[PDB]
């Protein structure tokens, strides 16, 4: 019954803004200090900001001062983070988190007092990059050269994530390996998918990789045939 539901993530270019929401349920929202914490892909947790139970006291990390604004609406059990003038280094999963102890403890005479977090949201992804929406080029990777053959699709130069790949419209699943994308210096992604099949099937079965990049409305079913 006690949870936090984040929304408002997205993909943007540098200099743009974004607003995150954290809808709270299960507890008296108005009695707890709230935080935002972020995690860049593959790195540690970085605290972003805190706001006191009643909104009067706020702190944030220097790198977001003047850019990000933590606020809350107690009458609607929601925590906000207004993100302006975004930079590539703001790219991360953003979590809201609730103080373990309520204002009985966290509202001192002098200060807001921190004793740990207890409840975390699921997170929302913010991606900041110079790149523009671009659909992939899809290239067949043909088999050649024991009684097994490997064939694939190269899904090249797309932005943003994600892309889904399947084979023969989901009918072919054994021997399928789809690899996480590489992020190139250009800001574009590429990925590949491979399937190992019996060599003896190559003249009686057709192999088609189904590539869907929803953000660019790109859907391609690419036939992969023996080379000649």
């Amino acid at each position: 019954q006690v949870q936090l539901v984040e929304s408002g993530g997205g993909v943007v270019q540098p200099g743009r803004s974004l607003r995150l929401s954290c809808a709270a349920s299960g507890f008296t929202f108005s009695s707890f200090g709230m935080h935002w914490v972020r995690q860049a892909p593959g790195k540690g947790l970085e605290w972003v900001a805190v706001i006191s139970f009643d909104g009067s006291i706020k702190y944030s990390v220097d790198s977001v001062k003047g850019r990000f604004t933590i606020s809350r609406d107690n009458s609607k059990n929601t925590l906000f983070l207004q993100m302006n003038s975004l930079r590539a280094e703001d790219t991360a999963v953003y979590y809201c988190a609730r103080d373990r102890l309520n204002y009985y403890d966290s509202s001192g005479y002098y200060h807001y007092k921190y004793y740990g977090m207890a409840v975390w949201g699921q997170g929302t992804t913010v991606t900041v990059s110079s790149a523009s929406t671009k659909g992939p080029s899809v290239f067949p990777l043909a088999p050649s050269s024991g009684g097994t053959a490997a064939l694939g699709c190269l899904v090249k130069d797309y932005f943003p994530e994600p892309v889904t790949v399947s084979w023969n419209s989901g009918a072919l699943t054994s021997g399928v390996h789809t690899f996480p994308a590489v992020l190139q210096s250009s800001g574009l992604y590429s990925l590949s998918s491979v399937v190992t099949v019996p060599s003896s099937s190559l003249g009686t079965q057709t192999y088609i990789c189904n590539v869907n990049h929803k953000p660019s409305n790109t859907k391609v079913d690419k036939k992969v045939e023996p080379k000649s």
Binding site: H35, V37, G42, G44, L45, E46, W47, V50, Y59, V61, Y95, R100, K113, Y114, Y115, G116, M117, A118, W120, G121, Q122, G123, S137, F139, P140, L141, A142, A150, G152, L154, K156, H177, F179, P180, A181, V182, L183, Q184, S185, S190, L191, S192, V194, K227
Partner: protein, 213 residues
């Protein structure tokens, strides 16, 4: 880099206990309560310990916390595979006026047997060459532990330009995968007799080669 120093990794075998340190200064751990959070792959963090050594409702006997002045220690006994995760210490810092987290300690549970990588290397496709691009694709799967080094060679000489390589990622079968891409012009693809992808894992190397002809 971080204000609190945690070891980047530790490991022990199923059933053993392991220890994870978190070092700080008087303005954080010295004067404030430390919590420890566990993060499993693709999930939010979860509170393990608060007030230095307390376990919240539902966190089992196996986890514990100690404080020795400006340092703190997490203890995990009777290790289970499901304890594989990143562990973070956190606290308030009086000087910075911020919650501060250690960098993270990746916990590995031993026992899982070594697995050598399968390497698959594709040349540039006809279609890609026609669009005046060229990409060599090197796919690396089913290896454990989850670290490899990739090196490309053309006619025996190293190739550093145009190489982009992903970090390893965990497959669902608990082994790891990775991939490396070499971009060339069609001219420089045709100008060499061979290109080769060399994947080194625990000191051993697996090589595949492709050629225009």
């Amino acid at each position: 880099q971080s204000v609190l120093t945690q070891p980047p990794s530790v490991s022990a075998a199923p059933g053993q206990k392991v220890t994870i340190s978190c070092s700080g200064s008087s303005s954080n751990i010295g004067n404030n309560y430390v919590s420890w959070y566990q993060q499993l792959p693709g999930t939010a963090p979860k509170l393990l310990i608060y007030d230095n050594n307390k376990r919240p409702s539902g966190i089992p006997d196996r986890f514990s916390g100690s404080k020795s002045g400006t340092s703190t220690t997490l203890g995990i006994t009777g290790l289970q595979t499901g304890d594989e995760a990143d562990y973070y210490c956190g606290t308030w810092d009086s000087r910075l006026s911020a919650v501060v987290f250690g960098g993270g300690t990746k916990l590995t549970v031993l026992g899982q047997p070594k697995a050598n990588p399968t390497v698959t290397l594709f040349p540039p496709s006809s279609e890609e060459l026609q669009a005046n691009k060229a990409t060599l694709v090197c796919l690396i799967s089913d290896f454990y532990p989850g670290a490899v080094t990739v090196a490309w060679k053309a006619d025996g000489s190293p190739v550093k330009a145009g190489v982009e390589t992903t970090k390893p990622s965990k497959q669902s079968n608990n082994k790891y995968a990775a991939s490396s891409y070499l971009s060339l012009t069609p001219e420089q693809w045709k100008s060499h007799r061979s290109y080769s992808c060399q994947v080194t894992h625990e000191g051993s190397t697996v090589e595949k080669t492709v050629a225009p002809t």
